[PDB]
Amino acid sequence: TLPVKQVSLSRKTAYGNDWIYYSLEKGKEVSVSEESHAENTDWDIAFNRYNVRTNSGASGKGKGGALLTNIKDLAACTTVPQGTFTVDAAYTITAPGTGFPPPTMESTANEVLCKAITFAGPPPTYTPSDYVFIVRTASGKYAKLKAKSFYDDEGKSGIYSFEYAIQPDGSTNLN
């Protein structure tokens, strides 16, 4: 069976285009300039608050994308289900600065993975999806991924946690 990696991002992001770039293939945060991200295949997924990009569509030149499954157990996801992968397109994010309602800006992100964590409040509550997502990497490999938490170890919000397994052989076999 493929190994399952637990990931907690290294920091909370600012609002605006402060993205943490991650290689699912290599299992690490990667240095990727915001200026050049859309011409850079060193990243598979990227996080700004609980917004998520793939290396696809409006976000990048890769073969990336995402698919929501109706499977809840990562272990029970053994293959990529039938369905069209969603690629990245224009997405509204919180922008830097004072004011309520908060200032926003047009960015790019993935409609499927942006729902991997949902907010309700008060009190401020960040809820990971029960579901497995398929993530397609910049090279087009298939991974199975779940959101875990938006809370640090004190229970304060800002840190995106997830778990995934990646099939390095390029197949849709995710056992």
From TrEMBL:
The entry's keywords: Lipoprotein
Keyword Lipoprotein: yes
Name this polypeptide is given: Conserved hypothetical lipoprotein
Residue range from the parent sequence: 40 to 214 of 214
